Design a protein around this nucleic acid. Structure first.
Ligand SMILES: [Mg+2]
Ligand SMILES: [Mg+2]
Ligand SMILES: [Mg+2]
Ligand SMILES: [Mg+2]
Ligand SMILES: [Mg+2]
Ligand SMILES: [Mg+2]
Ligand SMILES: [Mg+2]
Ligand SMILES: [Mg+2]
Ligand SMILES: [Mg+2]
Ligand SMILES: [Mg+2]
Ligand SMILES: [Mg+2]
Ligand SMILES: [Mg+2]
Ligand SMILES: [Mg+2]
Ligand SMILES: [Mg+2]
Ligand SMILES: [Mg+2]
Ligand SMILES: [Mg+2]
Ligand SMILES: [Mg+2]
Ligand SMILES: [Mg+2]
Ligand SMILES: [Zn+2]
Lengths: 122, 114, 53, 216, 120
RNA sequence: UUGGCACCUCGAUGUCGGCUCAUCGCAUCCUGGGGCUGUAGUCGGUCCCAAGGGUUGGGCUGUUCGCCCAUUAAAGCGGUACGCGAGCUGGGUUCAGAACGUCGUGAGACAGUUCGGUCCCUAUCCGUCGUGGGCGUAGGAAAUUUGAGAGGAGCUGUCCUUAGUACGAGAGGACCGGGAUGGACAUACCUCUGGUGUACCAGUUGUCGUGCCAACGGCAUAGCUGGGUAGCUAUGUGUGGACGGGAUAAGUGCUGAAAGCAUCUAAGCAUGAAGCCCCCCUCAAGAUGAGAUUUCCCAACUUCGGUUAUAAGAUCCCUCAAAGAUGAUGAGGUUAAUAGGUUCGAGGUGGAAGCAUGGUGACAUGUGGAGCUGACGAAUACUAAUCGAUCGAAGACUUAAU
């Protein structure tokens, strides 16, 4: 359950380390986003030398949340952290590597490249 | 019991091939992934931190550290999507809910074996 | 807030239409013949349900 | 078009053919009998009156609703049935398909039927505007003396009154509620129960009325 | 369960006092709501007494008060001893229902419904 | 809007902005339907019909405005004492303090600035939201009901296919039709995920007790801490705004004269909007126009007008909860499972006490998924729902038909 002002770890090597959520995309008055949703965000913290710089306004797909997600079979998945991956306009990641496990819902979202790069898909 | 009619109508949903286990036991849960038409078994291995409910509604939760990130999977105990459960290890704990492990990492999060 | 107009006798007594108490729920004691409250011990003779209390 | 009366037992779940988790309500719908048949000629409209849940026979010094009184006993005896706890009419059915005195079994519905369920919602007693009407609170701090109040009830000289329909505190719940387009998940004829997908109004033991869904 | 116009600790304390008083005197006059609450407490104590084992005696000690009862023979016994002795022996063959409540009517000072609750 | 006027109010009509709650208008921001286009397509421009629903979070500033960030189908314009302070706030503004610039000889002053600065009221009436009693509805009752009326609801994105088709040099790229899945909103509900859970279980500190040990109790926010049943719950689980019909708007036409032609109009016949009336949901016969159906009760005495206690029935009183401020509603009242107790369970906690064993010991292991357990399921008259009392019909007249 990610809303405006939520901070998230960046699970990639794009250069961003932590982002602050500016907007939940996908409708007027939409309050929260979860795994597989896209957010507009600003980079609060970055690794020196990366492609993405501090203060950049970028788009990210949520890949892990503490809230987790519920599945049609009544099972659940939850993570210890809220993490996102910075994406291009075609849903491809800005970086070249993904870190940490990601939820399978990314497949239904068609973030296939992120899913492929992810070390584990749960 | 619970209400007789609820039990009577849900009796056939219960599975009889599940091993005994307790919170703190390490489990290997073989889960059927049915993406598209292809079916495969993915194993989720972790410590049982929670069991709750009764009858067909019962659930359990298993916790693992994956790539340095904790991951918790909660299953209906009688879901047909679990092919089988293996009790890899019996843990020694002092309480039913192991929520304190969520805040522990590394050697601090180790469960003594029985 | 305060009454804008005084309350007439007619209006006051209309309001008091329902301000009253009822006769108690009482019956004659089968033992001693005195009135008692139903489901209560009879205070005159101390009996309830044909036995002394 | 079908109809039946039952009691809400409670909620549970079933696993579907693909392992999906299906929340269900258990409705016990035993002892439904057609007590009366209303027709356009006699009553002005067509309907079947169904009586549900046998109660005890009339007795001289009855003190509760557990025992049928003489009017109810005569009404039921005309259909040759035991007196019933609940009586409801179904106008949506074909009257010609029923006979007075007939049993109405849970087997009239089949798994997959889309249905409307009507009940009386749980009562909440006297409730405020936030709970009853879902209004916003005022601030909890910053000097506020407005937390759970209902807000302004009108304007001013225009209109020097509160309009009808103004939302205010009062008794909440206990309303007739229809939930449309639920589904029959299963029918268990041995136990006389219907599993309805999802949740339906009212407390446990509350009367529920199941009909073929009106929209199609 | 009733709250009896008291906070949680006060209500627990009053129920312990009332239970011990009923054990001692075998019949007490009190308010109706108090009697309806204390009947459960007293009868669970009776159940412990009938069980009779050391665990039951200690569980009962958790609830009973420390009160000395002077018998007719100048001998003294605690309420716990009375409960696990004569009261338990008395109700060996009875399955529940160890108390009864007899309504008396409102009292003068506040109109509260006075009742008598007694053993047996 | 800025004003003009000075007609109500100076034995007081609280004044900006925000919050809460809206309500109305249409001169329409979006969505719906159209005409014209310098409308190829995709887009647009402009005008007409249309008020059903919808019409976002933030940065700055007291701000309204306004600019900006990021969205959205869209981020409408106005009225309601520039709606709403006996609903809230009190940042600005408009008291007393102090200060700066400035003016003034000065006391002081400034739609100049600055820092600080008391927001009262138990609702009588109408009004509004709930909830009872009386009588009426030509006998007295129990249920089931019709629906005159009234209220609710009414919004929309994206993607897939048609089709990379029509159109277009190309770039790009459809109408119409058929599917899937969302946002916001509404409603019910607790199986699931969670929250709470002060008479559930467990760990634990200090101190005072139960004579001591052991085991327990009191107080320290429920001492604190880890969990948690029912209930109540959202952020959780379901469901909804679907499919249509009738009459229309702006329009679009057919046939057609006045007026040999022409002409949607005069007669006549079609078609045509998220809008109107329905369809969907809820209330509803105090609908005094008081409606309908089924079932129940039905005699004596009379000054022969009428009365009577009784009948069917319903209450008082009592045990209660799915109901609840209280009334009311519902489950029960011995020919009884209504509550308590008792017994067995579910769920929760997580291994009681005692004893034994191993350790110098703190402790550990066994007995033994033990012991305990509010609300949830079942059984059982052991306790209490005793004995009683009260209310409650005998059916008006006229006419017509039989
Ligand atoms: Mg306050
Ligand atoms: Mg007016
Ligand atoms: Mg205390
Ligand atoms: Mg003049
Ligand atoms: Mg005046
Ligand atoms: Mg217009
Ligand atoms: Mg509109
Ligand atoms: Mg104003
Ligand atoms: Mg005012
Ligand atoms: Mg101020
Ligand atoms: Mg001035
Ligand atoms: Mg100050
Ligand atoms: Mg729940
Ligand atoms: Mg539950
Ligand atoms: Mg202590
Ligand atoms: Mg003390
Ligand atoms: Mg002290
Ligand atoms: Mg032991
Ligand atoms: Zn007497």
């Amino acid at each position: 359950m990610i809303q405006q002002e939520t901070r998230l770890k960046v699970a990639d090597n794009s250069g961003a380390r932590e982002v602050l959520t500016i907007k939940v995309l996908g409708g007027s008055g939409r309050k929260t986003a979860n795994i597989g949703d896209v957010i507009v965000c600003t980079v609060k913290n970055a690794t020196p030398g990366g492609v993405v710089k501090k203060g950049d306004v970028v788009k990210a797909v949520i890949v892990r949340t503490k809230s987790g997600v519920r599945r049609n079979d009544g099972s659940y998945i939850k993570f210890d952290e809220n993490a996102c991956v910075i994406i291009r306009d075609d849903k491809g990641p800005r970086g070249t590597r993904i870190f940490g496990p990601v939820a399978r819902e990314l497949r239904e979202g068609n973030f296939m490249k992120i899913v492929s790069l992810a070390p584990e898909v749960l | 019991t619970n209400h007789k009619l609820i039990e009577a109508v849900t009796k056939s949903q219960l599975r009889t091939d599940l091993p005994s286990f307790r919170p703190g036991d390490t489990l290997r849960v073989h889960v059927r992934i049915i993406e598209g038409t292809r079916e495969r078994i993915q194993v989720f291995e972790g410590v049982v931190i929670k069991r709750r409910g009764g009858g067909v509604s019962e659930t359990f939760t298993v916790r693992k550290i994956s790539s340095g990130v904790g991951v918790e999977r909660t299953f209906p105990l009688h879901t047909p999507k679990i092919e089988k459960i293996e009790v890899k290890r019996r843990g020694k704990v002092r309480r039913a809910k192991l929520y304190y492990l969520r805040s522990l990492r590394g050697k601090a999060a180790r469960i003594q074996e029985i | 807030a305060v009454p804008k107009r005084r309350t007439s006798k007619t209006r006051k007594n209309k309001r008091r239409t329902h301000f009253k108490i009822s006769v108690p729920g009482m019956t004659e004691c089968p033992n001693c013949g005195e009135y008692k409250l139903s489901h209560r011990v009879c205070k005159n003779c101390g009996s309830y349900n044909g036995e002394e209390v | 078009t079908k109809g039946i009366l039952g009691r809400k037992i409670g909620m549970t779940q079933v696993f579907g053919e693909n392992g999906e988790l299906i929340p269900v309500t258990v409705v016990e719908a035993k002892e439904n009998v057609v007590l009366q048949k209303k027709t356009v000629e006699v009553d002005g409209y067509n309907a079947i009156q169904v009586g549900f849940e046998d109660k005890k026979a009339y007795k001289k010094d009855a003190k509760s609703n557990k025992y049928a009184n003489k009017p109810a006993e005569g009404h039921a005896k005309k259909a040759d049935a035991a007196p019933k706890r609940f009586i409801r009419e179904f106008r949506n059915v074909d009257v010609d398909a029923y006979e007075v005195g007939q049993e109405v079994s849970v087997d009239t519905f089949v798994a997959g039927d889309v249905i409307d369920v009507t009940g009386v919602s749980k009562g909440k007693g006297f409730q405020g505007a936030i709970k009853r009407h879902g209004q916003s609170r005022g601030p909890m701090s910053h000097g506020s003396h407005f937390h759970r109040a209902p807000g302004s009830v009108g304007m001013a000289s225009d209109a020097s009154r509160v309009f009808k329909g103004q939302k205010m505190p009062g008794r909440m719940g206990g309303n007739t509620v229809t939930v449309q387009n639920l589904e029959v998940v299963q029918v268990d004829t041995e136990n006389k129960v219907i599993l309805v997908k999802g949740n339906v109004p009212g407390p446990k033991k509350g009367l529920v009325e199941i009909r073929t869904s009106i929209k199609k | 369960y009733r709250k009896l116009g008291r906070t949680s600790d006060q209500r627990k304390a009053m129920l312990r006092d009332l239970a011990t008083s009923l054990i001692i005197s075998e019949r007490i006059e009190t308010t109706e709501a108090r009697a309806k609450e204390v009947r459960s407490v007293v009868e669970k104590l009776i159940t412990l007494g009938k069980k009779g084992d050391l665990a039951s005696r200690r569980n009962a000690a958790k609830t009973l008060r420390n009160v000395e009862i002077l018998n007719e023979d100048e001998t003294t016994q605690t309420a716990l001893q009375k409960l696990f002795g004569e009261i338990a022996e008395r109700y060996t063959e009875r399955q529940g229902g160890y108390t009864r409540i007899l309504k008396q009517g409102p009292r003068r000072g506040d109109g509260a419904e006075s009742v008598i609750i007694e053993l047996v």
